Amino acid sequence: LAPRNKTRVVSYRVPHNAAVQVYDYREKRARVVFGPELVSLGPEEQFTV
Amino acid sequence: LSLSAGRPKRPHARRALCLLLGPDFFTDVITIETADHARLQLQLAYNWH
């Protein structure tokens, strides 16, 4: 589809009854985000596929 | 790390850089014989960590 803007903050909308795992490889801190929250990657974070 | 993989678990079939030490499982096909000399093959799954 339309190519994404690499310079834009990468974001994802976790659905209801769902969770994601992201690890900040720079600051060395993991977190699990629950619920319908919106998750935005930091400059070094990644998504646990 | 050079590990084993495949349906009959052949050796040197998966080179790896990091070792995964989380709850997983691998499956192998085992051919065995009974005391009545009946040849029968198995399919097992080994939960490991």
Binding site: Y25, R26, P43, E44 | -
Partner: protein, 49 residues
């Protein structure tokens, strides 16, 4: 600051430089922008480290 007949040194910073009669310009350098947890391998050719 005193320099010998073969001494190399680096001129850097916000400034206007005019080459002297006894000074020959060898190379122009640009800083390498590195994010945190990124880096380069530099060899100190004077000592090799």
């Amino acid at each position: 600051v005193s320099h010998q007949a073969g001494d190399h040194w680096l001129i850097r910073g916000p400034l206007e430089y005019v080459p002297s009669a006894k000074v020959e310009v060898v190379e122009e350098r640009q800083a390498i922008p590195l994010d945190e947890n990124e880096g380069i391998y530099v060899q100190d050719v004077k000592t090799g480290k």
